[PDB]
Amino acid sequence: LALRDVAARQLANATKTVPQLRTITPRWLVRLLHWTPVEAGIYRVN
Amino acid sequence: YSNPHDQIREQLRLTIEIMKERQESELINSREYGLLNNVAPGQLVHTRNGAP
Known part of the structure; x- marks a missing residue:
């Protein structure tokens, strides 16, 4: 018998x-998307 | 909303302005310190007719 x-x-x-x-x-x-930064949280699309 | 004006900066600026107005009011009007309460007897004058 030896070590177990x-x-x-x-x-x-x-x-x-x-x-x-x-x-x-x-x-x-x-x-896959393109990401644009928004400087102060508002983005207006004209 | 921190562009071009920092929001926290303006908030603290207006707070400190109001606090310094209160500080001046307390330099004049406090009950512990304050000029209008710490005036010795004999240093208080009264008007003669009411108008200065």
């Missing part, structure tokens, strides 16, 4: 990932 796997695993680091969110979408529309 769980007992040996008590001395090991796990690789932890950042939390995964399944509702993330590629959001293509935001990538």
Whole structure:
């Protein structure tokens, strides 16, 4: 009988990932539009 | 809405103007300090006819 796997695993680091969110979408529309800046929050289209 | 005038800057500017008006009023009229309350007896004159 030798050292076990769980007992040996008590001395090991796990690789932890950042939390995964399944509702993330590629959001293509935001990538496809052209964005113009509005200096003070008002945009008049003549 | 901070272009071309900063909104916080103007808000604080008008606040400080009102506060300094109140400060002058208290320099004249406060009950703790204030010129009209800290005038010694004998330093108070009265008009003779009412008009200055």
